[PDB]
Amino acid sequence: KALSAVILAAGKGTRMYSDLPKVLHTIAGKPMVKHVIDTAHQLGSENIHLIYGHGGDLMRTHLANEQVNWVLQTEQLGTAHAVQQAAPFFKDNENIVVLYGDAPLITKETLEKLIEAKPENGIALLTVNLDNPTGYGRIIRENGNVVAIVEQKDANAEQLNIKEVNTGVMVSDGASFKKWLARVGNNNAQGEYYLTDLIALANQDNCQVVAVQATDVMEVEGANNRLQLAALERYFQNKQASKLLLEGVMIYDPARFDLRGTLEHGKDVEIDVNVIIEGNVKLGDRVKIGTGCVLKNVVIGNDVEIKPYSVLEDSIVGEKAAIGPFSRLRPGAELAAETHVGNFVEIKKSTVGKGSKVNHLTYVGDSEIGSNCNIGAGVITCNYDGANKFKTIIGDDVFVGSDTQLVAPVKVANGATIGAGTTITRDVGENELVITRVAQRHIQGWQRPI
Template sequence: MSNSAMSVVILAAGKGTRMYSDLPKVLHTLAGKPMVQHVIDAANDLGACAVHLVYGHGGDLLRQTLHEDNLNWVLQAEQLGTGHAMQQAAPFFNDDEDILMLYGDVPLISVETLQRLRAAKPQGGIGLLTVKLDDPTGYGRITRENGQVTGIVEHKDASEAQRQIQEINTGILIAGGADLKRWLAKLTNNNAQGEYYITDIIAMAHQEGHQIVAVHPQRLSEVEGVNNRLQLARLERVYQAEQAEKLLLAGVMLRDPARFRSARYAAARARCRDRY
């Protein structure tokens, strides 16, 4: 378990072409709040010393919308992969802190899951969030030897045997600042996509003898990303159902549990009703 200070990097540079909107993808709202704000809130709840927001498309609008004192704005002018995005933020990493990597379009990641991931990170190693899917098509596969994580192979680079692996990478990980900077400096784009994959650092860590510990989220919805409006609508329904369940179990009356703005809004309405 790591007792180091921690900073968070949120990748939010994607344009979101499949949203068919001029609005940056991460500013589309879920339960009345931009997706990326949900992620920023989670980072703040974890006690992050700093939040590095890697942006590209729609930077001016992002700055106008998000008002956080501890946000460090990091420009990724060209989108050349997740590893490239992290390379832009690397100059801001302290050697003696942990760096948690999150995504602005994965809005339902829970603080509880991230706390478990942070606690599981071994000294000098990597904590990695993974899930098992019945159909893992398109996702990076987790490779193991004798039960130990040894690497991640992206779908387009995977062999037929590797494509049978059901455990996949969610993209969320935590590593030490000094180690992460060293690994990021070694990344190449020698792959089918011609991009710099952050996933390549897993094999680097393994080759150096560092342990990689995999942790699973409590719910699959926590690691589901949004690429189109249908996925956003589905995640909003999941969020509403989860919040409704919490409120109902706490004794709050909801006329329609399937539709309300947020848990805070519903709780406030409940407190107002209790006054009369």
């Protein structure tokens, strides 16, 4: 049968001490709630009902593009009251999974096992074993089925030793949710309508409640502060790195590796310590990444070596190219195959042709460089004052001498040669040699003040 998801995300998150609502704080560069919405989407949810309240405006701006049904809960009357806000949109013959925006590491595989175990007209309750279950609702099984969730304050000596506890995550059909939520009361110390009470209501109706144990505790762990958030981040990062290592990526130290998006990789990829991968990154075969690199939204061809402390963003690098150390690729940098980018070099919105080298103390911006060019140390592409970034065009096999200024708009045709310390403001012809005529004063017997 069909499936829809409900995500609780109305929490203030007071203990984060932030202007952001609780669920917008990120895990691996992504808001906590976005992990949940994506997991719900990978399950095949027709609808994803997002229960929101605190920081409504911020939720809407940060999650504007999410395919969710925005359900405002004006008052936090309890988790059952929150689910009931979305209940008029539940299809009677569809399954509904209840998730929490601040417990983001819940897996598609655990939820699939939970949905699968759900008995007809009953509930599938997600449970977990804790070494210290103190404070949590103990799961009581009788004839294999969950008969009660016994709270810490109510449990007897024997029940206190039960390690299996309630996570709040559950699956039931829409009609059963509509029916039971209308029957939840708030007669307890907190005066709240608890979704927990649906287990007692199911048993009252002689409907079966089946327990499904989660793989890891960290999957159901919520973050109430930035310390807990950091623990979720380390667990998530270690999980991503282990999957990569088992896929054949040589990550020198999985404890000093960060993936904040997606990684597509070839075989024999080597990633040194303190590397950060952001957005959508694709590495070809035998790519080597040196210590301290940051790759954001990049495409790296086969056999590329990125030497230490290189920062690349919205760039493309061709096969056998050599980058770094200390290279900066800014958005629009397109390096063809067998290119060379060295230390203290900045490339921005420029194309660099096959075999070309830009190895030292250079700025290349809004330029087109052909194949087999030699861009000398200290070369800078610049503009006139009041200009609107006008473009530098360099053809094939051009030599640009050290410390030359290329003043855009300007073209340098194939095979041209530019001498060191030149100011290029006018177009250079095919095979034109341009050298600066220097005037110098020479004074003999100049005794230095030493």
